[PDB]
Amino acid sequence: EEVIAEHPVLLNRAPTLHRLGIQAFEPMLVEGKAIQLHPLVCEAFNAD
Amino acid sequence: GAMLDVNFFDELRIGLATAEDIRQWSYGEVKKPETINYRTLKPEKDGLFCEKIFGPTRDWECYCGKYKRVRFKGIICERCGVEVTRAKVRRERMGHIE
Amino acid sequence: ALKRLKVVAAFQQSGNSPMGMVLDAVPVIPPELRPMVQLDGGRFATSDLNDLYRRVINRNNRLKRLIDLGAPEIIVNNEKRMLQESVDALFDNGRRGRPVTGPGNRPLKSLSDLLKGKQGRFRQNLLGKRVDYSGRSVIVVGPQLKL
Amino acid sequence: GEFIPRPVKSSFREGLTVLEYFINTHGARKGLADTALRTADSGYLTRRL
Amino acid sequence: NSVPGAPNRVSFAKLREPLEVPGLLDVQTDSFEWLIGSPRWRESAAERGDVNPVGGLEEVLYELSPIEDFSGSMSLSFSDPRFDDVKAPVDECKDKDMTYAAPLFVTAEFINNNTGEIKSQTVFMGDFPMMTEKGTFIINGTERVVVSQLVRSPGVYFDETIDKSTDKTLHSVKVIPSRGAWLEFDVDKRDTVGVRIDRKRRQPVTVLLKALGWTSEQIVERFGFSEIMRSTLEKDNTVGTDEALLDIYRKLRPGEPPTKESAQTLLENLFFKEKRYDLARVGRYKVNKKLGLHVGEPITSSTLTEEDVVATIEYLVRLHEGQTTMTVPGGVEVPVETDDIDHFGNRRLRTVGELIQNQIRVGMSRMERVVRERMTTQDVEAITPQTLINIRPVVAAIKEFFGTSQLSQFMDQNNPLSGLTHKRRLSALGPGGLSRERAGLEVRDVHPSHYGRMCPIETPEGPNIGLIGSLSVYARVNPFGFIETPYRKVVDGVVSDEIVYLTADEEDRHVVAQANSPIDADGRFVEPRVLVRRKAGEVEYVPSSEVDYMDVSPRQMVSVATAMIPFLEHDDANRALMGANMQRQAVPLVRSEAPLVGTGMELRAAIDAGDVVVAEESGVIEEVSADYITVMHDNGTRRTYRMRKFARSNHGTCANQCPIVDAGDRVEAGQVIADGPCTDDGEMALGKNLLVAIMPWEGHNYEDAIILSNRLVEEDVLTSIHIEEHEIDARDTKLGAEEITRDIPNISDEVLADLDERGIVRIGAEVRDGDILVGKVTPKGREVRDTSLKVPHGESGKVIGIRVFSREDEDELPAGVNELVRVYVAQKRKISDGDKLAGRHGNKGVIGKILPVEDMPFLADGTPVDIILNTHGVPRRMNIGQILETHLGWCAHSGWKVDAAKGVPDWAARLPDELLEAQPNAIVSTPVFDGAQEAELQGLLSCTLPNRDGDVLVDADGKAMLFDGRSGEPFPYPVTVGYMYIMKLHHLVDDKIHARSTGPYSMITQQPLGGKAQFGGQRFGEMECWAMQAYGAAYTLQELLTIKSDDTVGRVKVYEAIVKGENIPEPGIPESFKVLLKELQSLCLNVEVLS
Amino acid sequence: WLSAASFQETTRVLTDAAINCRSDKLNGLKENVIIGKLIPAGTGINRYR
DNA sequence: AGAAAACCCTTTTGTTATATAGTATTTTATCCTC
DNA sequence: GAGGATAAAATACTATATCCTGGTTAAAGGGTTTTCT
RNA sequence: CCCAAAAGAAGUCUUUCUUUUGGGUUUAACCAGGAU
Ligand SMILES: [Zn+2]
């Protein structure tokens, strides 16, 4: 947890149609096996 | 220019190649359609994998076996004719068919 | 005349000579770029380039023998035709006539197929590459993270 | 592409009959087909641009 | 229903179906036993096609024999194919990797045409794979299925096209044979009726006609009624007949010395010989129908004839003339019209029998060439039939087909429904059919002739949409291969029960009514006007006096998978499709449960799919146990049924079977006696009934996500079992001495603890990633390499079964091995984030957050809801069906009682008897297209029993009042609650997650490999380097393409800098660039890097 | 010729470039991606580099 | 001494292609001119 | 009547998103050699 | 660059240093089936 602090990570989805398909977030640990995504960017990625 | 490589790139220049250049690139002549001998599982001689043309298959190890130590470097084998060097040279040397 | 002038001017301006069109020697790609894979059980799968080079070498040896041993012009001419076809298949398989097929009636990947389409070393191994420090997963929604 | 002059007369709450459902699938499928082919085509135009 | 021991599942159906659903696997089983000629098929063809019963092998042999030399001095013939008993039973063949087959023998007779010496022998023709009784072949231990193919039927096809330059209609005809050479007669601008013999250049038909022996007088005598024919006659430039043949030779076969004899021979051999032009039997029937030549004579002969060619030319010219009907001398008149190539009267179905017959045909052709050649290089009076037959090509062809093809596919065994739907599949792509990348939008549509022959809903969603479909419930394949459907015939407005099977053409000719029409209980329509289907698929109102046929019942258009969706007629086709493609991807759960609201089709699908055990004969149960069941038949005999316990399926799901009978019960023939993977008492059970609310909740179920309660984890309500298989073979090798030994060279004592004396993990030890399963050492060529098979990356779970095959035990091992130890590892996966639950109607989602059981919206009495769905997804996608289901689900759970105190209420007048009242947890069924109306649902919801105390939790609208468990206050407005049947799809997260820091690299180019297996690294594709360029970030792109992928020194230097805290070094150049330079130089291009 | 060769008609572009003996000055964004050097745009330009 | 099973080499009728859309270059066919 | 010039047709080449997993990877014939009877 | 084994030295009751040998591509191409 002390290593990843303030260490950006790139998230991408395919197809990457337009410029906003690749975005850099800050990672935080969660429980399980699924990447958690912010709901306000689903339109940019076009991800359901 | 720049021979092998490393960042002095300033221009790529393509062009037709003549027979003389083709015979310049090659380190030997392939004249036998044998890939590898099954029993020895080692390259044939004068074939499509000959070590004398394209280089040794193992790091600092000649085909005959007269040399297997690093200190021996650059000595063209006096018996088998394979140059003692690193195996990566098999990714660079080219042959030519006459 | 205008459509022709392009190539004549191109060969006129530069010091290069047209004799490069007709080959006298055929280069051979380094082995590591056409490796054979010895899958378990002696299943040595060979890259198509190996088979095409094998054909060319066989025909060249046969023609050399026939010339040295002495033969009528007709047989030598036919052997030269076969050599010409073998080289044509080596450089661009399927451009003229029936493709040289191998196991199970399939075409063989000559050299020119390594630099073409979405399988060549121009748009599948130079513009986009697999990378380290990476992963993938299924995404879910969390209305607790900030933006 | 021409309209069927029947036409459908029932709402999905009341439930369609058999024939009406058939003539509905008629036009329903081409939507998916065109979706696939157009999403295939768009990439070529983006690449050339 | 009619199954002796089926559960009592009450139905809302109003209509009655005269015809029971046929055997759902009958297509395959009855299309194969035709091939071998079993007595059952002989009996079936006796009551139908008794004129000429012949099996596929018999037909091939008769067409082949006799084989004669050019001189005709000797001949070889075959006859009477015969089959022996199978070598081993099904279970043993599956376990020991032995193909399921039987010997084949044939009687070969050799006759010398100058001595009269006849020599007969029985020659062995190889091992012929047979078919298990449930429709599947077994090959090399795996189970395979052969899919039927849709192809364009052979015959004559006419079509007209508009001309751009001149705006004239141009008609064209194609005579497409089976294994022949085409010939097209087409008209064009500058009207000129030409030919295209084979696929060569054009030429006037008059050339062909004269070549056939027609004088310039005869043609104008008969073809004297059109200007085009006379114009072509005027401009022919062909003299006599010989010049015609020579000209034909100059085009058919260029660059040859033309001569009359050879030209005539070649022309005759192309078409008029039963050697290179076979219209089969279907083709000849179709041609005779289209031109009406021989209506009476039986179809015996499959080559063209001059009369057919002249008839087709006349037909084409008349069609261009605009005629309406034509009369051919010696034949009845027919209509002249263009043809369509999607009408299911023109697309035929090559089933499993036909494909194997074709493969045997080509194998025998090769064997025939061999025998003909050998017939002239061996001295007479030493030749015996066994010394001329070479069997290898036939077995080679059969094996090639069954191992390598686009129609012999691995069975999909996610669950029984997947198999049942895979056997009844029709694929239009394969050898001899269109291709996935070369199909237009005119073949993927749904032609109006599909009604009742191919389901319009069930179809893949990807790029295959339209090329693959499923055979409907009632359809059958007639002898020629055209698909037929039943219709109940009406005589004088009286609906009889005479069922007649019709193909596409006959259905086109007549007028057909609808199944769910107002019958007045005496076979008479209530009102004169009723929807019908006319010739071209038009829907219109015709009075109830012209109707000629009616559908046997509704549902006739929906395949097996789509017939199991309740309230199908309320859902849009687009979502019913995703509902019918998401029942073939369930996963057999640890404990199964039958759905509360089904569609009456579960029982038949379960019993036919073959995954349940069915008592073969009536009797009384003697002893029952988890392993086997003993049935004591009525007359002495006794039978023992063995059960498959924890057997791996082709896609990694368990295949349990447990009995449902006790030691004293009596069973009846056809009764279900043991459940299967996804069955519950004989009914399909793909999922679970969960309590569901339809409110949006805190955004966790945002954009199709789902929320589960924790009760679905504690109590294993959704808990699957998966099984993985690991193999390793100790190859003999040229060096030899490979052995599966325990002692692992250069190994620790702890890591070797589990291994048994032989060197195989003890059954019952948890082999987590990084353990040993087998100890294998092979010579180095000690001089050995320890290829000790280890648990690959990401697996775990106990070891439930080992199987070791030994050469010393004289097993059938692969050539050049001694042992083939194989291990199984099994694991129980619970539900968790990332899974892909989905209902039936197409409401797919991925579990978003498994909340603890305390903070869930709970009803007034304390019951917590077990799932939450969004409201914003229902109305927009038009799958309202689910909401209706939800309501009905609740009515099924709570149990209702319509109060018939003073007359039945009007809304329940037509409700069937013994449905006015139901006990709690009562199962009901609503057939697909005749189900529970809205008024009936309102009535049921209006009256429902209290739960325990005198409280009703769901009011009339169907919405209850929920307490918010997280905060405490009640939600201001009522919410919908009910019971919905949801499944667990096979897209679990644990098979998807993957990461890589540093791992294996490729060999030709130094980039990392791809895929979760090896170690794999994600691909930074082409259009993910445009986004980086667009942002303006350059350093990140440079490092993503140089020091992370293929810069040989960059990788090690960055690793060292990172571990030692230094600043990352600079990049070099990529290896793939040098590979490109070498590839260019190999082409004689002098590429040089100037400076 | 590198960019054009990587775009379309690889054979024709390569052959005509070989005939004309064209020398490709390295400027653009596709060739600098190919040879693993900083793109001459964004952060890579001289003013900010 | 003859027969049967095991090496070493070679090499793979016209099939079946249900294609469109666009452009670019070679025939060839016919029309116009001298 | 013969030759040249222009439409026509006739062929030749080029292109038609992203990602993931599972099964196979040669046979067949001719010529030659060794062991068993 | 990395790992494995053998021997010697120091301390801890198990880590570091030195020497010898061995080593690293589960690669690859096809067909098929899926996902968004
Ligand atoms: Zn040496």
UniProtKB/Swiss-Prot annotation, chain E:
GO terms for cellular component: DNA-directed RNA polymerase complex. Keywords: DNA-directed RNA polymerase, Nucleotidyltransferase, Transcription, Transferase. It comes from the Bacteria. PROSITE patterns: RNA_POL_BETA. It is an enzyme of class 2 (transferase). InterPro entries: DNA-dir_RNA_pol_bsu_ext_1_sf, DNA-dir_RNA_pol_bsu_external_1, DNA-dir_RNA_pol_su2, DNA-dir_RNAP_su2_dom, DNA-dir_RNAP_su2_hyb_sf, RNA_pol_bsu_bac, RNA_pol_bsu_CS, RNA_pol_bsu_protrusion. Its EC number is 2.7.7.6. Gene3D superfamilies: 2.40.50.100, 2.40.50.150, 3.90.1100.10, DNA-directed RNA polymerase, beta subunit, external 1 domain, DNA-directed RNA polymerase, subunit 2, domain 6, RNA polymerase alpha subunit dimerisation domain, RNA polymerase Rpb2, domain 2. One of its GO terms (biological process) is DNA-templated transcription. One of its GO terms (molecular function) is ribonucleoside binding. SUPFAM superfamilies: beta and beta-prime subunits of DNA dependent RNA-polymerase (SSF64484). It catalyses: RNA(n) + a ribonucleoside 5'-triphosphate = RNA(n+1) + diphosphate. It holds the Pfam family RNA_pol_Rpb2_1. The RNAP catalytic core consists of 2 alpha, 1 beta, 1 beta' and 1 omega subunit. When a sigma factor is associated with the core the holoenzyme is formed, which can initiate transcription. Belongs to the RNA polymerase beta chain family. DNA-dependent RNA polymerase catalyzes the transcription of DNA into RNA using the four ribonucleoside triphosphates as substrates. This is DNA-directed RNA polymerase subunit beta. It comes from Mycobacterium tuberculosis (strain ATCC 25177 / H37Ra).
